[PDB]
Design a protein around this ligand. Structure first.
Ligand SMILES: CC(C)C[C@H](CC(=O)NO)C(=O)N[C@H](C(=O)N[C@@H](C)C(=O)NCCN)C(C)(C)C
Ligand SMILES: [Ca+2]
Ligand SMILES: [Zn+2]
Length: 252
């Protein structure tokens, strides 16, 4: 039975210096309005989903805090930070290696991440070969789970993910950005990618197209695009059932 007191995953939303400059036009109001409206549209998808195809619905997400990093993080030589001016490992590239960026963000935000259901980084960098985001889970996801980093020499938490709103040299459509964050939060909620081998979970274009957990970002105009497949629902249903009592809160 859904507990109305434990149905919301509260988020720490972080906008880095790239997002602030290129999406927020160097303004706090523009930056926060974009993120507030995006999370609210993503929340409508989650909240209206019946994970068991019956009454197990009303689970969603809400912003607890928006951290706005206005300028790059100054670093000492050899030191790295997710908000530093240069990309890593190749400073000549517009973007970081996406996996290394998610690991770095998780390391730098560890203290704050331990106090929230999820932390999500919003950036503006053109990841190699069309990548839009990355997230733990679907080994992480909703509710902070510690991982001792031998390189980092401390515990980091795997309740993180990231979204970039830049792809192939331009700002993606808001309809596309909504799907990126929905997909990444889907991994956090426990969903894996929809496989081609299960037609019910990866339909043809005339059968409504692909669902949100498909590995390929494929347009945004098809019926199924903004919905979770039955494969995703089964995985997320099992996650919510064991994780809601652990870190979910009452909807504000
Ligand atoms: C929201 C999408 C589904 C996220 C995934 C990555 C992923 O599955 N992260 O959780 C992605 O970036 N997919 C890319 C993608 O489909 N991007 C599109 C927009 C693209 O740029 N087209 C590439 C065509 N050669 C890949 C990595 C497959 C190239
Ligand atoms: Ca890209
Ligand atoms: Zn994915």
């Amino acid at each position: 039975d859904p507990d109305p007191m434990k149905n919301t995953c509260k988020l720490l939303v972080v906008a880095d210096h790239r997002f602030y400059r290129y999406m927020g036009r160097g303004e706090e109001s523009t930056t926060t309005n974009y993120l507030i409206e995006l999370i609210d549209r993503v929340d409508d998808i989650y909240r209206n989903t019946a994970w068991d195809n019956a009454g197990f619905k009303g689970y969603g997400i809400q912003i607890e805090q928006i951290r706005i990093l206005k300028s790059p993080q100054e670093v000492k030589p050899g030191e790295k930070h997710y908000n530093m001016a240069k990309s890593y490992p190749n400073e000549e590239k517009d973007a970081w290696d996406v996996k290394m960026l998610l690991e770095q963000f998780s390391f730098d935000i560890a203290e704050e991440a331990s106090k929230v259901c999820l932390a999500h980084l919003f950036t503006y960098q053109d990841f190699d070969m069309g990548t839009l985001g990355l997230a733990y889970g679907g080994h992480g996801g909703v509710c902070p789970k510690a991982y001792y980093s031998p390189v980092g020499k401390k515990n980091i938490y795997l309740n993180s993910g990231l979204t970039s709103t830049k792809n192939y040299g331009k700002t993606i459509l808001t309809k596309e950005a909504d799907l990126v964050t929905t997909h990444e939060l889907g991994h956090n909620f426990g969903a894996e990618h929809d496989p081609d081998g299960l037609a019910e979970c990866a339909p043809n274009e005339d059968q409504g197209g692909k669902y949100v957990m498909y590995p390929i970002a494929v347009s945004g105009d098809h019926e199924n695009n903004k919905m979770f497949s039955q494969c995703s629902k089964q995985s997320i249903y099992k996650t919510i059932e064991s994780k809601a009592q652990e870190c979910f809160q009452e909807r504000s």
